[PDB]
Design a protein around this ligand. Structure first.
Ligand SMILES: C=CC(=O)N1CCC(n2cc(C3=Nc4c(C#N)cnn4C(=O)C3C(C)C)cn2)CC1
Ligand SMILES: [Mn+2]
Ligand SMILES: [Mn+2]
Ligand SMILES: [Zn+2]
Length: 453
């Protein structure tokens, strides 16, 4: 038996509210952040044109076994051949035409299927970044002629290609090609294809648009309940918490939301239909499955609301010895170096994060000086490939400073792990720093000037 979680909030913005996605997301945040996910129905005439050739769009399928609590990690189809497989799979599974299968029954059956080890149901799906073989479902600039209709949606805030690069995703001004975090993912679903419980890298927001097809079913948990959920999952599937050694080696799983609810974890659900958005909030766990053949597009983003959580996240990563996707401090300093061009509310928020950064950095440098690290030299950390500037102990990506030693050339530790670098006395160590404290205060003041005008 399956008891569906309560429905998440559904928002229907007027065109005035809808015009600015960041203003709207800030408006709904008090409500939506208590549920982790929410659904947004755009104004009825906001209809970006879904147009593609099913025979030239093609992708390499991923394959999925559907067993609850079993670990998962993070051939060629055209859209047409995948759709034909997907449709025959579902109609044969239920011996029904695909749109007479009620969504409630698919949900019930999904949770039955994944709990029964007697059934070896495997499905396939597409998940990849936009590429030349498979691009965004939103119109993008390309010197193809677009209809005026498509041109109307080229610059939309809700065109997910624009959202990262706008004024207000602080992830915009990052120079480091992240790929995973400024670029949309494309999701080609079939019945029962599912995404395991996860949060986004660096606790970012995410926004997901279902271009067309049968619904996508979601489960979401608010950010405040994140550790609650992890403790429940640790108890019931400890295999998923044995630290796997890479950023590509991370273990995730399917788990019945009723199990979370039994352990007093708040869980919300929704069916996302074609033309609707789902937004996930920072540190909001989510999972779900596709009801049938469909096509979705999603992107991470970071608002000013998120900045302190991004700092908290990197602290949390350092403690799990988890790899970072980027350096949060490097992003902050990059924005400070562009203070004159920043949005003024962005500038004010970055300035507050930078004040914490500088005070933390001052204390860390005083601690390591008391350990006998005397020598120091400036170092342009941002020039180093990420794998050359990770702390040996905690894998954090260094930027503000690190400790090196002549005894272990090329190795670095962050300033929390001075004692973990090598066995040589401390006077052989060297503090490598991006900025002196005297460099840092004028950068923060530029932000204040930009903000106060
Ligand atoms: C990060 C590195 C990496 O390699 N990967 C990410 C994790 C993997 N992955 C993603 C999915 C999906 N995620 C989602 C969401 C969300 N959030 C919303 N809808 N949705 C899907 O329908 C599917 C899919 C079933 C089509 C499935 N596997 C593999 C790729
Ligand atoms: Mn099973
Ligand atoms: Mn996600
Ligand atoms: Zn460290």
């Amino acid at each position: 038996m399956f008891l569906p979680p309560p429905e998440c909030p559904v928002f229907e913005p007027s065109w005035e509210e809808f015009a600015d996605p960041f203003a709207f997301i800030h408006k709904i945040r008090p409500i939506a952040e208590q549920t982790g996910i929410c659904k947004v129905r755009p104004p009825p005439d906001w209809q970006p044109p879904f147009a593609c050739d099913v025979d030239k769009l093609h992708f390499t399928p991923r394959i999925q076994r559907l067993n609850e609590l079993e670990a998962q990690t993070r051939r060629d189809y055209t859209l047409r051949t995948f759709g034909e497989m997907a449709d025959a799979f579902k109609s044969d599974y239920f011996n029904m035409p695909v749109h007479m299968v009620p969504t409630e029954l698919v949900e019930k059956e999904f949770w039955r299927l994944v709990s029964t080890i007697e059934e070896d149901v495997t499905v396939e799906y597409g998940a990849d970044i936009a590429s030349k073989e498979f691009g965004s479902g939103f119109p993008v600039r390309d010197g193809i002629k677009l209809s005026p209709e498509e041109e109307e949606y080229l610059d939309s805030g809700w065109n997910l290609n624009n959202m990262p690069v706008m004024e207000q995703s602080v992830l915009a001004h990052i120079t480091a090609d992240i790929c995973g975090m400024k670029l949309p993912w494309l999701y080609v679903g079939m019945c029962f294809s599912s995404f395991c419980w996860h949060i986004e890298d660096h606790w970012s927001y995410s926004i997901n648009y279902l271009h067309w097809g049968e619904p996508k079913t979601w489960y979401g948990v608010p950010g405040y309940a994140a550790e609650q959920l992890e403790n429940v999952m640790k108890k019931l599937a400890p295999e998923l918490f044995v630290s796997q050694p890479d950023l590509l080696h991370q273990l995730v799983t399917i788990m019945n939301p009723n199990t979370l609810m039994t352990h007093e974890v708040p869980v919300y659900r929704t069916n996302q239909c074609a033309g609707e958005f789902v937004i996930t909030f920072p540190r909001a766990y989510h999972s779900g499955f596709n009801q049938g053949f469909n096509f979705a597009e999603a992107v991470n983003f970071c608002t000013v609301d998120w900045l302190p959580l991004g700092r908290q996240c990197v602290e949390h990563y350092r403690l799990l010895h988890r790899y970072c996707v980027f350096s949060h401090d490097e992003m902050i300093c990059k924005m400070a170096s562009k203070a004159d061009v920043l949005d003024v509310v962005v500038a004010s928020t970055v300035q507050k994060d930078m004040a914490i950064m500088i005070e933390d950095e001052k204390a860390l440098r005083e601690t390591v000086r008391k350990l006998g690290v005397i020598d120091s030299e400036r170092m342009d950390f941002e020039l180093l490939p990420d794998d050359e500037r990770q702390c040996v102990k905690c894998k954090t990506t260094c930027f503000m400073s690190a400790i090196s030693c002549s005894c272990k050339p090329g190795l670095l530790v962050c300033l929390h792990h001075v004692k973990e670098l090598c066995s040589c006395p401390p006077y052989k160590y060297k503090l490598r720093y991006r900025y002196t404290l005297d460099d840092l205060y004028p950068m923060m003041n530029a932000l204040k000037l930009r903000a106060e005008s």
